[PDB]
Design a protein around this ligand. Structure first.
Ligand SMILES: CC(C)(C)c1ccc(N(C(=O)c2c[nH]cn2)[C@@H](C(=O)NC2CCCCC2)c2cccnc2)cc1
Ligand SMILES: CC(C)(C)c1ccc(N(C(=O)c2c[nH]cn2)[C@@H](C(=O)NC2CCCCC2)c2cccnc2)cc1
Lengths: 306, 306
């Protein structure tokens, strides 16, 4: 029993974190085989963060412009190239702790674990959802850039996020491991701001199923809804529309609990319209949208507490 | 910016987790140097969980009654002994991944990271507070016993919790690494239940300081309070009394923010009496008591956003 925001064990990623320095700027890099990946803004001059031209800044660097430190050991840079908003530094040593890994681009609403790091040293781990507006609600201080997000499946690490910058509301923006930003953000100092966000309906429904699996039914009702009638309510409450594809994704949780998806949607409609009347669901006084259907299946028992 | 429940990186603990089997029961153990620690209830018969006598059950076991598996490798047990509610199994191999470590008994209100494990395989990591009633709000399924809780300071792992059992309300009970239970619980099937809990006042105050450090002051007021007048309100709202010792602990956070402790207590008094008026603090619609003063200092900037 219980239900918590649960990160993946971080050891396989810890063994990949290094420190990258260029000029006076230090940040974190990810060392896999003989390549170190880091944000290209490591080369940005303090004097000009407003209008960097990265091609022009990078051509002025040599391999020995970059210092890479793995713990106490210096790794010699023997090549470098820019890929989108990342630098790929080739080093003289293959990381002996490289795990089985893949690079994947996650979709909005999906979750991943973040290993917050400073100066190449891991500091903390927590779970994040990629918001519909392409930001994450992380916890990051100066120098956290280059920290990574990942999921783990059967000892294969799927890296999906590298941290680049903080936005004015205190939320965080970054790229995939090909260097392509999530969202419309850019790696320079501009007035950019996170767009309007929305609640991840599929995740709320998954978490209501988690509550039933764990033994609680107080919020169910005798009603059903059509998809279109639910979506009229969702629009009013800034929830994402439910689609037939999302209904299909909820199939296994619906089967484990015996609650049809559209019946759970009717329960959610009533909770939105009437509130929770001072009660909790899975310990929470609000509806939670930070757990995917996969996260619920990963964490909950496969046997409902009937 | 940001503020999240943040666990310590788990890799140093992952390298210590093994599987222990006795008879038909399997659970997790902790392998440090040439010793494996695990819950003594691994020897309990399925037929008699109501009234086990562990001395009488253990004398009937030999070293080869115990199977220990580290990944795919079998570790031969060459000795065994009971210490309180733990077994200490001596094995033929010293763990080459043993970190610098200590065993410590934590106090109520303190936090630690939990590495949830099944069959000796780490599954997830999350942060827990030891509640005043000596339980934790974990997330644990059958076979999680022997999972450990820990804090990390300068690469030294302080182990403080080993998981033993789940209580009727779905919360979790366990021991320190000397095998002494937290709380009045016992390792057998009884009617035992968690006692009444209370809110950890010192942690709420620390988290209000975190909110100011991160730039938010909306909940402050022009009033102050005496310790005794605050404690009259605390009793009404099931908050722990504030003590002078706890006031002293808040010294550094008070200095970083310029808010006297008793002035923050007046703010908390008003929040308890009037509620939060539909507003949030650090993203939360409720007052949070799961972060210690140390956790706030660990995670927040050392410079207040004034
Ligand atoms: C060059 C560029 C792209 C403008 C930049 C500058 C600084 C950083 N930040 C580094 O901390 C940092 C930079 N290099 C080493 N560390 C921080 C950051 O985003 N401030 C923002 C201030 C407003 C305008 C854009 C940047 C940061 C803080 C907390 C968590 N995350 C990141 C990130 C990007
Ligand atoms: C022998 C004894 C002390 C009564 C016992 C029995 C079972 C377990 N539980 C094992 O899962 C388990 C046991 N051995 C291997 N796995 C689970 C558990 O506590 N059920 C309780 C049922 C009510 C009465 C006491 C035990 C468990 C589940 C979820 C998370 N945590 C633990 C723990 C202790």
């Amino acid at each position: 029993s219980g239900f918590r925001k649960m990160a993946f064990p971080s050891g396989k990623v810890e063994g990949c974190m290094v420190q990258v320095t260029c000029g006076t700027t230090t940040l974190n890099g990810l060392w896999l085989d003989d390549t170190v990946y880091c944000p290209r803004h490591v080369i940005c001059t303090a004097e000009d963060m407003l209008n960097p031209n990265y091609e022009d800044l990078l051509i002025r660097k040599s391999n020995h412009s970059f210092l890479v430190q793995a713990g106490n050991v210096q790794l010699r840079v023997i090549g470098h190239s820019m890929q989108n908003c990342l630098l790929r530094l080739k080093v003289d040593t293959s990381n002996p702790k490289t795990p089985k890994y893949k690079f994947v681009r996650i979709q909005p609403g999906q979750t991943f674990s973040v290993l917050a790091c400073y100066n190449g040293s891991p500091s903390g781990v927590y779970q994040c959802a990629m918001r519909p507006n392409h930001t994450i609600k992380g916890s990051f201080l100066n120098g956290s850039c280059g920290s990574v997000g990942f999921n783990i499946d059967y000892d294969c690490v799927s890296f999906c996020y590298m941290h680049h910058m903080e936005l004015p509301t205190g939320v965080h923006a970054g790229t995939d491991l090909e260097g392509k930003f999530y969202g419309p953000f850019v790696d320079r100092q501009t007035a950019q701001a996170a767009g309007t966000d929305t609640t991840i309906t599929l995740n709320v429904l998954a978490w209501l199923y988690a509550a039933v699996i764990n033994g609680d039914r107080w919020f169910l009702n005798r009603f059903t809804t059509t998809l279109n009638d639910f979506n009229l309510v969702a629009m009013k409450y800034n929830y994402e529309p439910l689609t037939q594809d999302h209904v299909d994704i909820l199939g296994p949780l619906s089967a484990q609990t015996g609650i049809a998806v559209l019946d759970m949607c009717a329960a959610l409609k009533e909770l939105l319209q009437n509130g929770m009347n001072g009660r909790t669901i899975l310990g929470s006084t609000i509806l939670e949208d930070e757990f995917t259907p996969f996260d619920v299946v990963r964490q909950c028992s496969g046997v409902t507490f009937q």
